[PDB]
Design a protein around this ligand. Structure first.
Ligand SMILES: Nc1ncnc2c1ncn2[C@@H]1O[C@H](COP(=O)(O)OP(=O)(O)O)[C@@H](O)[C@H]1O
Ligand SMILES: Nc1ncnc2c1ncn2[C@@H]1O[C@H](COP(=O)(O)OP(=O)(O)O)[C@@H](O)[C@H]1O
Lengths: 197, 206
């Protein structure tokens, strides 16, 4: 099963989602995370501590891809046609802010003329409750007839401590660990019960 | 069996070598060319006519790779860190094309020091579009690389106008309507044979 996480602006949480989406699939089958992010943030992340899946470089995609039942591809949206055709679900992370969402919206025209259940937008790094950036973003894209995940990935320190320690957030010493994981686990759940349909 | 053709400059016949190294390998198994060149010239060489192998985009490498016996990847090197270590690990041999001129070699020189760290039978350097007997760019470049200790393909690709016709009609150089179609393909045949032979020794995987 191949899912590509592809984004229109840096600092979306794209890598973090690819890592968390691969830790999810790992629980169910053997999983490769392929790193096509020019910064190779994913490879650092695996080296820095450890991770319940092999991570390899985009250049190693053809060599290692036949070995794995689950593949998560981490990459920069550069052509949105090509990413879709290479996977079962294209996940596009976006943060709630006007600047990031506009970067998403200039692309609206390609995204429409593309296919309903071929991709899906994941709102990430959502500011916590006293704040409504979350919902307002949801409505903009919904208003835009642009398919979205039931849930979003809320903003937590935990996810940072996790880049730093080179582990999945579920493993980190923070009281939002479980809640942070649960955001991704829920996304896992909907991909798998989106893609097996 | 996977080989990567990677270059350090545009206009060195990388794509052209990838396309022709694929035709070679289509001879032994079903083969995929994965186009990872931003100009996607290879994908386009495909559409223009009919090549004897399947060409996909690099975004489709994970999806398509498990269905093929042989893979050629066509990619520009692109520095960010050790893009050399891991280009070599994605393939059975990294073929690295160069023309014999000043600035092509000059780009090749930037890398010789990292290329020397790589070990000796992970890659090998193919001299391409060698100008004909009259001028001797070809042999100087070979002296240059031989002195700096880099491994090279015994033979090099000559400049034949034919390679170009092969491009515009979208067919491999032999299919082309031209007097040295043959002589130009035997160049790739020799290159291919030396690849397949290198991958298959006990030294190779040491
Ligand atoms: N849900 C989140 N909550 C808090 N911080 C996050 C979250 N997702 C990512 N980050 C942080 O944002 C920064 C950039 O994330 P990253 O995934 O690297 O973005 P990009 O995918 O665009 O590469 C990192 O320092 C990471 O710790
Ligand atoms: N051996 C050759 N003889 C004549 N022309 C060649 C040869 N190799 C490549 N060319 C020409 O050079 C042009 C571009 O080279 P290309 O193969 O696209 O280089 P690169 O892979 O680095 O892009 C092509 O139009 C092709 O006609």
């Amino acid at each position: 099963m191949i899912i590509t996480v592809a984004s229109f602006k840096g600092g979306v949480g794209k890598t973090t989602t690819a890592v968390h989406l691969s830790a999810y699939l790992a629980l169910q089958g053997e999983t490769l995370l392929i790193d096509g992010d020019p910064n190779r943030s994913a490879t650092g992340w695996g080296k820095r501590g450890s991770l319940p899946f092999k991570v390899v470089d985009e250049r190693q995609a053809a060599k290692y891809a036949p070995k794995y039942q689950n593949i998560v591809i981490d990459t920069q949206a550069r052509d949105l046609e090509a990413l879709a055709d290479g996977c079962d679900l294209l996940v596009i992370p976006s943060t709630p802010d006007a600047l990031a969402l506009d970067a998403l919206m200039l692309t609206i025209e390609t995204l429409q003329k593309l296919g309903n259940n071929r991709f899906r937008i994941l709102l990430t790094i959502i500011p916590p409750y006293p704040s409504k950036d979350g919902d307002e973003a949801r409505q903009l894209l919904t208003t835009a007839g642009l398919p979205l995940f039931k849930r979003g990935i809320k903003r937590y320190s935990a996810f940072q401590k996790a880049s730093l320690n080179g582990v999945v957030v579920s493993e980190v010493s923070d009281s939002k660990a479980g809640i942070a994981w649960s955001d991704y686990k829920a996304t896992g759940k909907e991909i798998v019960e989106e893609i097996l349909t």
